[PDB]
Structure formats: C-alpha cells, structure tokens
Amino acid sequence: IKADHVSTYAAFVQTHRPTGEFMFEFDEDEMFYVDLDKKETVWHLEEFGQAFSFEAQGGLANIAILNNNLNTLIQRSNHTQATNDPPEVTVFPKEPVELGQPNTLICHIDKFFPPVLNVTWLCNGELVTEGVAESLFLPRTDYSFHKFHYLTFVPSAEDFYDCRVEHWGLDQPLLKHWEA
C-alpha cells in the first residue's frame, strides 16, 4: 500500500499478563496508549499530551470488544494455542560509547510470540533495579511482537552487562552479553 505516513491502532487481549493493551503508533512509533488499570491515556512524549487528547473509553471498551472476540475464537478454533516463537535479542547503546559519559543501553527483543516476557538487566552478574525503563509490547506486520528495554549506565572498561530474557519458546533464559 502506498503511503507517505501510516497511523495504526494496535491492540490485543490474551490469557496471561499482560491481559490487554491498546496503543496507537505513528510510522511504527508508539504515540500513546491507554493504561488499562489506571484507566488513563499515557502519552509517549510530553509534547503529545499538550496538543492532543484521547478519551480512555476508546481503549477500555475496545479491549472489551476484543475479549468477546477472544472467547468466540477460542470456541470456534477448538482451543488451538499458537506455537511459541522464540525471541531475538540485540543490545546496543543509544549514544557513542565514551568512558565516564552518561549513556543508555538498549535491549531490543524481537520476533517473539506470545507477548509474555520477563526481561531483566544484569551488571557484572547481579541484578539492576534502578535506572531501568521499558516500552510496551509493540506490534509487527507478521503479528509477532517486539519490545525495548532501557538502562542508563556510566560506561567503564571494567563493567559488562547482560540482558536476561525469559520466554516460553526458550528452554533456558537467554543472556545477551554486551561490553565496551
């Protein structure tokens, strides 16, 4: 399809957590989503919230419609569960690496289904609980999913980092090593 720009409403419902998601991407970048628990519209960039508004009912009720379609499709498909698609993990920094200069490490998990993921950062082999952030379960054209995980760190030649990813398509957690 010919397009100068593509705007897409993407949403899903499933049995496990996250049970639902309703988002809107502009040229494959998530512009906003509806928090299904807080019942609030969350904008990706604060500049979007000052120029646009979105009634959260547009997401909550749309999730409700899909849940009905879920139960209907479960019965007609004779309870066919989809094959687990293992994820692909790549780790790269946001800015060029300079020792002592604050940076951001990006873990990109890609091409996985179902959208049920446990992702965690490891610094020198131990857990990191601060300086972390994550994106939603983003959609793909082949109806698989990808996701971003972020870690703000200070580069040092004596530090090595790992992105530990758990998924049903993996018989053992996947460690993606990265170092300067």
Binding site: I1, K2, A3, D4, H5, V6, S7, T8, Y9, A10, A11, F12, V13, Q14, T15, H16, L66, N67, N69, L70, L73, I74, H79, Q81, A82, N84, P114, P115, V116, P139, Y143, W168
Partner: peptide, 16 residues
C-alpha cells in the same frame, strides 16, 4: 507451556 490464547486487531490509516 501454560494455556494461552490471544486475539489482536489493527486499524491502519494509509495517507498519500
């Protein structure tokens, strides 16, 4: 694998 079923939808606008 735990029992899991999914439904998803798209609403795509192609401007040109």
């Amino acid at each position: 694998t735990p029992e899991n079923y999914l439904f998803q939808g798209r609403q795509e606008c192609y401007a040109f």
